[PDB]
Design a protein around this nucleic acid. Structure first.
Ligand SMILES: [Mg+2]
Ligand SMILES: [Mg+2]
Ligand SMILES: [Mg+2]
Ligand SMILES: [Mg+2]
Ligand SMILES: [Mg+2]
Ligand SMILES: [Mg+2]
Ligand SMILES: [Mg+2]
Ligand SMILES: [Mg+2]
Ligand SMILES: [Mg+2]
Ligand SMILES: [Mg+2]
Ligand SMILES: [Mg+2]
Ligand SMILES: [Mg+2]
Ligand SMILES: [Mg+2]
Ligand SMILES: [N+]
Length: 387
RNA sequence: GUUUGCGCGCCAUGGGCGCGCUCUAACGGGUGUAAGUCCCGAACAUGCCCAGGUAGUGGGAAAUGUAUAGCCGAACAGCAAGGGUGUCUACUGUGAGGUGGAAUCUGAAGGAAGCUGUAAGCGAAUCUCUGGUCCGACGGACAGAAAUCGCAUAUAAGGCUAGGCUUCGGUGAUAAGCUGGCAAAGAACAGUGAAGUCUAAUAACUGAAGCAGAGUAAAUGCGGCGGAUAUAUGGAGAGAAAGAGCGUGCACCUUAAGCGUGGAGGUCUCACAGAGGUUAGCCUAGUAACAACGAACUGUGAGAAGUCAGCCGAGCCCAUAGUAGUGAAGAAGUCUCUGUAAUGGGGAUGGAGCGAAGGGGCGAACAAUCAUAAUGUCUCGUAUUGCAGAAAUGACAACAUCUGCCGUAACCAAUCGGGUAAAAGGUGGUCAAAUCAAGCGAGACGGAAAGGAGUUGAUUGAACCGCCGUAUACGGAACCGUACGUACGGUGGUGUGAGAGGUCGGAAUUUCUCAAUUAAGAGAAAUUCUUCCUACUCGAU
């Protein structure tokens, strides 16, 4: 009787609105989402009748758009009550639960202080999930067989049902962990399992690997699942370092994240690019606001300030490259506020001279007040304003 | 749309080939028939070293200058004919315009074959060895192409820039080159420096190799192989060898800003003749051109400024023009040798031709895009088959599970020797199934319709980045350039920059009309896009 809760007008138009805010790729059908609106406006009774009578035949590298609308409706009807069923320490794919408070909870329980962290990974998770056991757990939760029927025929056949199915299969494991009394966090697929003793770390490793391999039907790789120290194993782009005050085990962005940050930065502000530097300033601003809104809790202030110095040196180097003509280089430099002959010698020197750019009168030619007049915000200020 | 950039002609102050004299190693001597060629000698000044934080004397090792006849002139200065101004001004014309000046800018990398004077540099047949460099196209180095070989090469080789760290911390001089954190190349300065050769002398006083990174790219790097090498490339050895200036000759050969001349096509001005409307009187423009508003259009005649940028483009068309030119020192054409990738070059006949400039058109071709007898399957039966739920009873109290301990160590933290399934230990019986069983299915079996594995039309190809070869020049030998330097022949890449004016064409949309003024339908003025045009204004080469 729950497909009779599915096929209700507010649920359908909310699912439709969510799919058109997704703006997903069309793919094999190649069918555009406003025409998805038109096609559902002409096929609503047909699709709803097929849902009632279970003769729907959905078909997939990119899913079909009407199938995406059906996914969104199924997820919208299935997340409530399940959220009460799901473990409260599982922070994936729900409203009001993200990875940042997952790392915050992890910080709380390493303030409790479990030593060796078991990074449990499950390679090819959708391959290891059995359809029958997942449907069995769904049938144990919801008794009406029509939704079980459509989810089953869909599973034999981004996606908005894969979060719920992953959360179901992981949440049974989370309930078993709470049955053990063990402490652990997981976002979506990656599990950090926290234990204070290396012998107990290997014991919990063996227990969990055997429990995953037989009862759940899933498989855990022996590559990622090493019982290692927190400084050597990362969780969602975050590394953990030791505050040398004994009470905290503090967080930082893992160096691969900052490597990606630096790489995208340097590939965005190449001074051989032909685009105006206001556009590059705005793109830089987009990346920094996203990067703070993700990595707020983990500290890299001693690293991000060196990166700030790199930011302003790179901007001054880019502006010097974009001026590109020695005569107007001299003219713009003397407009900047330096004397004529120093501008002359610097302008004839201006070919190459990366060394004069990183330190010299070139670095004084564009300063912090001038780049604040340009309008780009610093990383440190976006820290001190952020909660 | 980047000062110049077109055709034809003349002229070397350019080069070559013959001739003539004369000069040549500081100054001097030898040597030998013969020295410009081979040998020998002095002084001063500089570099380098004795300073040992210094620096004036005082001395020494290589090297260099004074010091070949002579060359060539800096990214050096001064001059400078010319060229520009969208800057002022005097004159001249009815007018398009012309001319002369003041204020400047330029006077360049391709002919005032610009002038004068410098710094630095150079500076002698040929042979041999060697270092360095450059080249053997372009194309991230494929394809294509006449156009080396093998690897490597972008989340980035390899070259650099500044630090951390492992190990060692008097000999020099010379001097092509290499690098100074990257498009490429050059100058200057700085720091190093290959092959060798020469030298390894004298008494003092007042930092280099290797390992990991962090940076740093408009891409090449490394190793052969062939070749080139007069910025007279760095040197080493043979070599009684040739170099330099000046004059001069040729039926010798060339030059983009010099000199003379030629300008189509298209734009503008003016006076005549025909239309036009203004009220026999006026005007015939303004808008960059196109379109449009418009009376504002057209054949004449008189002029004026004026060209000249490969990009798909053979050839035909217009006009200067079959003219300027060129051609009897000898044209077109024919015949016979010959080269290249292609363009080309001789020779013999032959006895009059041959034959320009810029701008628009049309346009073949080339290129791109677009047109041109199984499986299988839907529907019932038929019993299996995939996972869950309490478990009479049977077997076993042995399996799941959370908690990191030993000592030793002067106090363990292998922080010292064990052990990571080290110990002490909590919690929960653990299961094979009599038994039955929602829901979703998934397969498997028959009966049930059939079916089965070359060519041409059209549209676009705006503009650019180059590269190679012969010829011809310059900055700066190579390299990098000078519009790809330019001409001709070869050859790959990128693909439609802004603003403004149009075309407001086509569609959506604001407003109207139509389909009944009803569709998310169609159309008309115009908003956006799109299509197309425009150097008109900017930007790019
Ligand atoms: Mg070449
Ligand atoms: Mg080359
Ligand atoms: Mg190349
Ligand atoms: Mg490397
Ligand atoms: Mg020499
Ligand atoms: Mg004239
Ligand atoms: Mg073209
Ligand atoms: Mg063309
Ligand atoms: Mg030169
Ligand atoms: Mg070259
Ligand atoms: Mg070149
Ligand atoms: Mg070039
Ligand atoms: Mg160019
Ligand atoms: N030009």
């Amino acid at each position: 009787n729950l497909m009779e809760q599915i096929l209700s007008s507010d649920n359908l138009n909310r699912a439709y609105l969510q799919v058109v805010r997704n703006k997903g790729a069309e793919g094999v059908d190649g069918m555009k989402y406003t025409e998805l609106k038109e096609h559902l406006a002409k096929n609503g009774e047909t699709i709803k009748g097929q849902l009632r009578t279970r003769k729907y035949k959905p078909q997939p590298g990119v899913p079909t758009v009407t199938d995406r609308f059906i996914q969104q409706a199924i997820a919208q009807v299935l997340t409530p009550i399940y959220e009460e069923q799901f473990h409260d320490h599982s922070y994936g794919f729900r409203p009001n639960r993200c990875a940042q408070q997952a790392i915050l909870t992890a910080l709380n329980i390493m303030n409790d202080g479990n030593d060796w962290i078991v990074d449990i990974d499950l390679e090819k998770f959708f391959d290891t999930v059995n359809h029958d056991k997942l449907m069995t757990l769904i049938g144990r939760t919801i008794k009406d067989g029509d939704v079980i029927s459509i989810v089953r025929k869909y599973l034999v056949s981004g996606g908005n049902l894969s979060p719920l199915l992953a959360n179901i299969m992981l949440n049974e494991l989370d309930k078993e962990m709470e049955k053990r009394g063990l402490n652990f966090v997981r976002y979506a697929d990656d599990c950090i399992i926290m234990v204070g003793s290396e012998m107990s770390a290997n014991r919990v490793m063996r227990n969990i690997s055997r429990f995953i391999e037989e009862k759940l039907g899933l498989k855990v790789n022996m590559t990622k699942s090493k019982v290692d120290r927190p400084s050597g194993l990362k969780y969602l782009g975050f590394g953990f370092y030791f505050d040398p005050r004994a009470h905290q085990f503090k967080a930082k962005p893992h160096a691969k994240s900052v490597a990606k940050f630096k790489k995208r930065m340097k590939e965005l502000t190449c001074r051989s690019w032909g685009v105006s530097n206001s556009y590059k300033v705005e793109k830089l601003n987009q990346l920094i606001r996203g990067w703070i809104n993700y990595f707020k809790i983990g500290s890299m202030k001693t690293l991000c300030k060196e990166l700030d110095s790199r930011i302003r040196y790179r901007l001054r180097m880019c502006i010097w490259k974009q001026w590109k003509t020695p005569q107007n280089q001299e003219k713009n430099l003397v407009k900047l506020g330096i004397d004529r002959n120093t501008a002359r010698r610097v302008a004839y020197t201006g070919k190459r001279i990366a060394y004069v750019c990183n330190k010299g009168a070139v670095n004084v030619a564009i300063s912090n007040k001038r780049l604040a007049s340009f309008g780009l915000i610093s990383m440190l200020d976006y820290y001190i304003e952020k909660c």
